[PDB]
Amino acid sequence: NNKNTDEQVTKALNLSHFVGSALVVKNDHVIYNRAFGYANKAKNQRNKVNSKYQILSIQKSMTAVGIMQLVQAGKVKLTDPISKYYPTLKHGRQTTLRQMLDMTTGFRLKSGSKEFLPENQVIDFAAHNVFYYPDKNGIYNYSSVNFLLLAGIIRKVTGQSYQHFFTTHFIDKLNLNETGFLIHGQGQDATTGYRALADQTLPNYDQTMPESKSQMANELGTGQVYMSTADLFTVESAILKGQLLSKKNVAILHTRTATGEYGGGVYNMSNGIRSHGLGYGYESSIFLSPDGKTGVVLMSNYYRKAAGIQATANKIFTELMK
């Protein structure tokens, strides 16, 4: 029952010290939709169901889909070497687009620019400053620069910005009204990130988390977007239902590797897909069934390592799936 569901999920969230918005869908029907704690404590603004949160690394699933759309259009191939798009790279030149999508490259960018740069200069800074580790080639190892460099390929091949691509193929395509780029401001129902102590569980809101324009620009392709929980579910479900990309091409994209569950910008699990993001005081979590009909989205503006939301979403999803 929805009464049962409401009591059980609210208890799980309360015991885990949840701050943010929670959405639970079963067989295409919303069965739980509630918010907890504060979007901004100093202004006495409560989080709401349609509050906007950082999707963080979950954005990489969307960058991946963009690449695979270009594959279907005949404009790139997953076998392409990175040097085809970045001809001044010194090392790792043989690395394929497939490996970039699967976090099986030896690339790592230690830091982005401290300056606020436009997209083309963010891309150039990465290509000039990335390190290459031959012993990490072909083995799962999480490295965000892979997806920033994928965002640069979208820009190069299309002749338009990544923001323009994202706006066209996600925001406009799916009529998203609670989604955008953090650099331009969140608008109504904005949230503020909070900084926690290592062992903190109870929220206290005594320290806000800054993010610079530089930090937001440097998350090109990788964690620069805000969404409501509804908008995030709409996107991920639309992917798996084959509304953005044929189901044949989703199947190609979303394939695990020999060394990891990660493939095509998501974790390919035993019972659907998972994506997790952390950064800037925020945490994001989605678990979704393979057919896109049943899942859980939690997003928080008050990340606490001692009260992580992914574990909570995992518990909810496991119960949901039986």
Side-chain angles (χ1 to χ4, degrees), residues 193-196 204-210 302:
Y194 289 90
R195 182 195 292 284
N204 72 37
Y205 303 95
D206 86 272
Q207 186 51 260
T208 58
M209 189 72 93
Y302 201 155

Side-chain angles (χ1 to χ4, degrees), residues 242-283:
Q243 302 175 19
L244 303 184
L245 189 60
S246 67
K247 289 195 297 195
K248 169 60 181 159
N249 284 325
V250 175
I252 292 164
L253 180 62
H254 286 183
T255 303
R256 66 158 294 156
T257 69
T259 62
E261 284 180 348
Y262 198 87
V266 299
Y267 295 94
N268 302 283
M269 311 298 276
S270 296
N271 56 350
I273 65 171
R274 172 181 73 84
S275 194
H276 187 229
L278 290 172
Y280 316 111
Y282 286 79
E283 183 180 7

Side-chain angles (χ1 to χ4, degrees), residues 17-243:
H17 311 280
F18 187 63
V19 171
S21 303
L23 177 67
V24 186
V25 176
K26 176 156 191 71
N27 297 316
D28 296 325
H29 289 172
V30 173
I31 63 173
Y32 189 87
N33 203 5
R34 204 161 155 195
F36 300 78
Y38 292 99
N40 185 309
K41 173 74 187 188
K43 301 177 160 186
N44 196 39
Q45 284 169 357
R46 296 274 190 187
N47 278 321
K48 299 191 66 96
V49 156
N50 298 93
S51 290
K52 292 153 183 177
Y53 304 85
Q54 300 211 28
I55 69 169
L56 302 161
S57 290
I58 305 179
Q59 187 182 333
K60 292 186 180 67
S61 67
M62 298 161 204
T63 299
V65 162
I67 288 287
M68 195 71 197
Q69 294 176 299
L70 292 175
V71 169
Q72 180 59 23
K75 288 150 181 300
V76 307
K77 300 183 182 163
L78 297 191
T79 55
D80 285 347
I82 190 173
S83 58
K84 177 183 195 200
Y85 304 97
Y86 294 90
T88 59
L89 282 184
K90 280 182 297 168
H91 298 290
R93 289 175 63 94
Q94 86 292 337
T95 301
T96 68
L97 269 55
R98 178 78 275 182
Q99 296 177 260
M100 297 166 77
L101 286 160
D102 299 347
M103 297 300 197
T104 57
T105 83
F107 289 121
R108 174 158 147 285
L109 183 63
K110 293 188 186 186
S111 289
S113 175
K114 290 169 184 304
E115 294 169 51
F116 172 43
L117 297 183
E119 278 189 12
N120 72 298
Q121 295 175 20
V122 172
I123 294 298
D124 288 350
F125 179 100
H128 285 129
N129 289 281
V130 68
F131 280 68
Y132 180 70
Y133 302 105
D135 286 350
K136 290 177 175 321
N137 181 57
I139 296 155
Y140 166 73
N141 73 98
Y142 200 91
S143 184
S144 292
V145 76
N146 289 323
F147 277 76
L148 180 148
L149 294 165
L150 289 169
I153 291 166
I154 297 173
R155 293 174 37 72
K156 294 170 189 288
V157 168
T158 63
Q160 305 252 50
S161 68
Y162 178 85
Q163 292 187 22
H164 173 94
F165 189 96
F166 191 92
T167 301
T168 301
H169 294 292
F170 294 88
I171 298 180
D172 293 347
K173 170 63 165 174
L174 293 172
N175 303 304
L176 313 171
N177 302 125
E178 298 154 6
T179 297
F181 290 88
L182 287 154
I183 191 68
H184 300 310
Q186 300 173 56
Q188 89 158 82
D189 305 316
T191 64
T192 304
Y194 289 90
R195 182 195 292 284
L197 296 169
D199 287 338
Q200 179 180 353
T201 53
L202 190 67
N204 72 37
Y205 303 95
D206 86 272
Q207 186 51 260
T208 58
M209 189 72 93
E211 193 184 7
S212 61
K213 303 193 173 88
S214 165
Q215 282 173 314
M216 298 172 150
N218 290 344
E219 284 282 357
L220 176 53
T222 58
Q224 55 181 158
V225 163
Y226 66 79
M227 289 184 179
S228 64
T229 60
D231 280 8
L232 179 53
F233 190 94
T234 297
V235 168
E236 299 288 338
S237 179
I239 296 168
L240 296 192
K241 291 193 174 172
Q243 302 175 19

